[PDB]
Amino acid sequence: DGPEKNYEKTLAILQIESEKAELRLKEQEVRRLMRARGDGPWYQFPTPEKEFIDHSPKATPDN
């Protein structure tokens, strides 16, 4: 075919793998921040359920 094919295919492969590197490191820092502080969707550890509390009138006022 020629040299242009190899050259430009190499360029494509290079941008692909560079972007992958970028995203892997980004994922590392993202997981770090999400775990150190639960601001994000991940590492949101469970809490007690709210809907199983009874809010009705009790037997004593100062419940």
């Binding site: 692909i16 972007e19 992958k20 995203l23 892997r24 994922e27 639960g38 601001d39 994000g40 969707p41 949101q44």
Partner: protein
Amino acid sequence: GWVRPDLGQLSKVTKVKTDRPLPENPYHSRARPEPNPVIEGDLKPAKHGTRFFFWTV
């Protein structure tokens, strides 16, 4: 003219009124912290698939 209540008349709710207001925020509850926001987006394919080690797709 005081008539004795019958069997189950003192065992039910009775709908009082008063000049008082409602208590605003009983339990002296503090403000609730705001939940973490939801990521708004129509999700797309993963960028270059799995960034695993060397798998292409």
